[PDB]
Amino acid sequence: DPAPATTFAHLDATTVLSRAIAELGIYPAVDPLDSTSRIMDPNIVGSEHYDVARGVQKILQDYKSLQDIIAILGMDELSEEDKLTVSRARKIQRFLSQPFQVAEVFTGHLGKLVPLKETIKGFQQILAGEYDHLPEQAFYMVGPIEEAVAKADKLAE
Amino acid sequence: DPAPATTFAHLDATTVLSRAIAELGIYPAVDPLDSTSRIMDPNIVGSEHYDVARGVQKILQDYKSLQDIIAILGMDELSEEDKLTVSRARKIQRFLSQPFQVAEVFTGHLGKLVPLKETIKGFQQILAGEYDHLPEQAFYMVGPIEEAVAKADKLA
Amino acid sequence: DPAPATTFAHLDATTVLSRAIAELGIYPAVDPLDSTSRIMDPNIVGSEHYDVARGVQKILQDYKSLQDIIAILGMDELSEEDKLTVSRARKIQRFLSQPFQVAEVFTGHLGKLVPLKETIKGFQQILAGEYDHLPEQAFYMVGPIEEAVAKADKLA
Amino acid sequence: ATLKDITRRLKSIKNIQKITKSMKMVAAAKYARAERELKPARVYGVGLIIGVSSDRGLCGAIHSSVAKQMKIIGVGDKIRSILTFKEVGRRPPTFGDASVIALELSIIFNRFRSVISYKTLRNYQEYSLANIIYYSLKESTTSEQSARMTAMDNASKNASEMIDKLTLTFNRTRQAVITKELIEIISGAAAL
Amino acid sequence: NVISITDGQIFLETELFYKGIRPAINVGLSVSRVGSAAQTRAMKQVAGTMKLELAQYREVAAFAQFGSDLDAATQQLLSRGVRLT
């Protein structure tokens, strides 16, 4: 749309929200593959923040590009590494969600604020395979990565 | 289109005919899922008529949602429960076709008029699984369910 | 699109230059199945011109069918009928190439301008099998069929 | 009915078409080796429920066709899950595989007609038992890899037709968006 | 307009960008009509081989995550291809 399209060039950082994402219960409904920042540079945020950020986006793009194919040919036709990034990407999609203090009337969850180092570490860890044994849902709608381990135990029964 | 879209609000019943359905030889080419009636209410038509109608529409909608997979992969990749709704749905579709007196030149069949009770019974029986053994084509271009059964026996 | 659609109403032929063909080294890189003519009609050109062209087409189309059965079973599991059409088709593909006079500088080969009756004759005979004893690369970058003989001797 | 949609649908189906075509040919090569290997295994074959299928799906009604004639050993991953050995169908069945199966101990399997068709002392007994396990097994992958080749042929052709039809829809929508957008501009300009 | 006016185009894509192909150049679509005439002999040499090997890669690139029993010749195309990429 001319209006939003013309606004992009006036910005240093953009957060793009998506109805397709909100529809899933992923809130905040941010598109991880359409939000950008002028300071997303290894010389500014450091190579560790940057390499994790880029790794998260890669695994989501790869999943995005698999979605529709396996939705027809089945999950079984995937190699044991193609389906590894499927499980991991789905955890990461869930770990990007987060209950907002200001959204308690909607989530029924207490709001969480997550420090940068913990955000980075959390995603670093899922990317590295550290939680392949936890279930997808444990990553849905929590703050720090410890809350997802907590949640996994709570789910066990 | 503005013309038809504006007309919908003026009607108590709408019969929406579909080219897609026509081209499959279903006549009359009524879209079972796009045609509605303000008196389709259990307090007006009674609960048996209402329930059979809603059951037909459910199976047809269920079938419609399976049709993406059918188009690419075909019947073989379906579960046994889904193969059943497909085969009942396809029977229902054909049972909704009907020879019209006015269209005898085009069908090559004599025209039929079906009493409402025989209409309810026929579809009620198909839904209940009473004719899973009969082939699809037996339900095409008949009046009452009895004709599709006779037609089934004739197909030897 | 209106622009191409309006243009096509005026076209009597298409010449389709193809990158696939170019990378296979066939000059000129004309797609022999994709290019068409409106006057490719026995009532307009020869009844002999028409059947040679139709025969060339069918064999080139038939060669394409067999190309899946080659990278699977190898070019030996084919029947004697099917081996024959591969050998003839490939000689036809190469026989459709031509050294141009206008490209004497860049290449080095001498330019050829083939008369219509000689073009018709050449292809009619590769189809007949009057050159099955000759090697495949005898037909490449020559003019008339008389240079396919001269080039097959110079390779002995 | 959005240019946005159509483009996504088109992207997936072009790749499905490419996959199913490669899978078609993988199976075509496997059916090739399996039909030739079937010769010294059919005449060789002339001299509790056992269900013979495999691990891999996408071969139409191979796995469900024996599972129906089933209703107790299930050779093939797919037979245990729809109703006991893993890692079959993938690599051609050796007489050694047939012995690994019989060591752990009516036979139901798919018998190869064509690429398109298929239908569902105490030292001597052990060799004749393994002679049946092997026979059913060799017959089975011929029938599976034929079927998968065929089914993957069909899916590829079905995807290809859907691609054609969606491209047409794409261009019709594409042209109408241009025209509608222009008519809006004109009507506004004219009304002044 | 600007596509027909120019001698060639470098096409960038979002999807290449997030897959890690940065710079995000669609090498199958991008074109320079000047081409070789604007390359030194040394580049011309290796670039010519790269082009061909990448084209042949593109033909096969969807058998990547769906390829167990591909012939060794095409595992070679896949491998040379991901590496050149």
Swiss-Prot record, chains B, C:
Subcellular location: Mitochondrion inner membrane
Residues with PTM N6-succinyllysine: 154
Source species of the chain: Bos taurus
Residues where Phosphoserine is found: 47, 65
Protein family according to the UniProt entry: Belongs to the ATPase alpha/beta chains family.
Name of the protein: ATP synthase F(1) complex catalytic subunit beta, mitochondrial
General function of this protein: Catalytic subunit beta, of the mitochondrial membrane ATP synthase complex (F(1)F(0) ATP synthase or Complex V) that produces ATP from ADP in the presence of a proton gradient across the membrane which is generated by electron transport complexes of the respiratory chain. ATP synthase complex consist of a soluble F(1) head domain - the catalytic core - and a membrane F(1) domain - the membrane proton channel. These two domains are linked by a central stalk rotating inside the F(1) region and a stationary peripheral stalk.
Modified residues (N6-acetyllysine): 58, 112, 117, 154
Subunit structure: Homotrimer. Component of the ATP synthase complex composed at least of ATP5F1A/subunit alpha, ATP5F1B/subunit beta, ATP5MC1/subunit c (homooctomer), MT-ATP6/subunit a, MT-ATP8/subunit 8, ATP5ME/subunit e, ATP5MF/subunit f, ATP5MG/subunit g, ATP5MK/subunit k, ATP5MJ/subunit j, ATP5F1C/subunit gamma, ATP5F1D/subunit delta, ATP5F1E/subunit epsilon, ATP5PF/subunit F6, ATP5PB/subunit b, ATP5PD/subunit d, ATP5PO/subunit OSCP.
Top-level division of the source organism's lineage: Eukaryota
Name of encoding gene: ATP5F1B
Curated annotation (Swiss-Prot), chain D:
Keywords recorded for this protein, A-Z: Acetylation, ATP synthesis, CF(1), Hydrogen ion transport, Ion transport, Membrane, Mitochondrion, Mitochondrion inner membrane, Phosphoprotein, Transit peptide, Transport
UniProt topology in membrane: Peripheral membrane protein
One MF annotation (Gene Ontology) recorded for this entry: proton-transporting ATP synthase activity, rotational mechanism
Positions carrying N6-succinyllysine: 24, 71, 86, 165
InterPro entries from the UniProt entry: ATP_synth_F1_ATPase_gsu (IPR035968), ATP_synth_F1_gsu (IPR000131), ATP_synth_F1_gsu_CS (IPR023632)
Chief subcellular location: mitochondrion
Cellular component, GO annotation: mitochondrial inner membrane; mitochondrion; proton-transporting ATP synthase complex
UniProt GO BP: proton motive force-driven ATP synthesis; proton motive force-driven mitochondrial ATP synthesis
SUPFAM superfamilies attached to this UniProt entry: ATP synthase (F1-ATPase), gamma subunit
Any single Pfam family the record assigns to this protein: ATP-synt
Modified residues (N6-acetyllysine): 14, 30, 71, 86, 119
Function according to Swiss-Prot or TrEMBL: Subunit gamma, of the mitochondrial membrane ATP synthase complex (F(1)F(0) ATP synthase or Complex V) that produces ATP from ADP in the presence of a proton gradient across the membrane which is generated by electron transport complexes of the respiratory chain. ATP synthase complex consist of a soluble F(1) head domain - the catalytic core - and a membrane F(1) domain - the membrane proton channel. These two domains are linked by a central stalk rotating inside the F(1) region and a stationary peripheral stalk.
Sequence similarity: Belongs to the ATPase gamma chain family.
PANTHER family found in the cross-reference section: ATP SYNTHASE GAMMA CHAIN, ATP SYNTHASE SUBUNIT GAMMA, MITOCHONDRIAL
Protein's UniProt name: ATP synthase F(1) complex subunit gamma, mitochondrial
Taxonomic source organism: Bos taurus (Bovine)
Organism phylogeny: Eukaryota, Metazoa, Chordata, Craniata, Vertebrata
Curated annotation (Swiss-Prot), chain E:
Additional detail: The siderophore enterobactin (Ent) produced by enteric bacteria binds Fe(3+) and helps bacteria scavenge iron ions from the environment. As a consequence, the mammalian siderocalin LCN2 plays an important role in defense against bacterial infections by sequestering iron bound to microbial siderophores. LCN2 can also bind iron bound to endogenous or nutrient-derived iron chelators and plays an important role in cellular iron homeostasis.
Residues at the site labelled Required for activity: 30
Tissue expression as described in the entry: Heart muscle (at protein level). Heart and liver.
Cellular compartments annotated: Mitochondrion inner membrane; Cell membrane
Described function: Subunit alpha, of the mitochondrial membrane ATP synthase complex (F(1)F(0) ATP synthase or Complex V) that produces ATP from ADP in the presence of a proton gradient across the membrane which is generated by electron transport complexes of the respiratory chain. ATP synthase complex consist of a soluble F(1) head domain - the catalytic core - and a membrane F(1) domain - the membrane proton channel. These two domains are linked by a central stalk rotating inside the F(1) region and a stationary peripheral stalk.
N6-succinyllysine modified-residue sites: 44
Known partners and oligomeric status: Homotrimer. Component of the ATP synthase complex composed at least of ATP5F1A/subunit alpha, ATP5F1B/subunit beta, ATP5MC1/subunit c (homooctomer), MT-ATP6/subunit a, MT-ATP8/subunit 8, ATP5ME/subunit e, ATP5MF/subunit f, ATP5MG/subunit g, ATP5MK/subunit k, ATP5MJ/subunit j, ATP5F1C/subunit gamma, ATP5F1D/subunit delta, ATP5F1E/subunit epsilon, ATP5PF/subunit F6, ATP5PB/subunit b, ATP5PD/subunit d, ATP5PO/subunit OSCP.
Name this protein carries in UniProt: ATP synthase F(1) complex subunit alpha, mitochondrial
Species the sequence originates in: Bos taurus (Bovine)
Post-translational modification summary for this protein: Acetylated on lysine residues. BLOC1S1 is required for acetylation.
Family stated for the protein in its record: Belongs to the ATPase alpha/beta chains family.
